[PDB]
Design a protein around this ligand. Sequence first.
Ligand SMILES: NC(=O)[C@H]1CCCN(C(=O)Cc2ccccc2OC(F)F)C1
Ligand SMILES: [Zn+2]
Length: 139
Amino acid sequence: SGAIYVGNYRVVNRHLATHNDWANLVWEDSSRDLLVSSTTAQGCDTIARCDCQTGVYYCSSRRKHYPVSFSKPSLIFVEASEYYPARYQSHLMLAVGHSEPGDCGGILRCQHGVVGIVSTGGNGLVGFADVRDLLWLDE
Ligand SMILES: NC(=O)[C@H]1CCCN(C(=O)Cc2ccccc2OC(F)F)C1
Ligand SMILES: [Zn+2]
């Protein structure tokens, strides 16, 4: 679990969105596993606007942060679940690192700010849903 709070927005994994998130929906994309809902309180997370391929992510199954090299946002296969069927998830970035069910929502950050959130994993890999292209999160 975990979310990004920037301005009047809350960014979460679409498969983990709540009734409140859906009732205050701004945008959602099943192919990216992202949902953005509106908030009354002002968020202060800074979003990165860069092409960094190195950063640090929070791994809740170890209560630790890990440094990672990650790939550029791309289309990548993801097995079924209480939430989705086999499909290509777009805007996904992979890294060699630990992740297990329960780790979704952990933030990935570089020197410029928030890069994305944990969305997939398995086999010694971790996948992050990129948010750097969502320029509207700032305005
Ligand atoms: N379709 C999706 O984006 C995910 C929906 C929930 C299920 N998905 C996973 O990958 C679950 C998973 C399995 C083994 C290790 C780590 C895992 O993820 C965690 F890091 F994000 C896929
Ligand atoms: Zn950066």
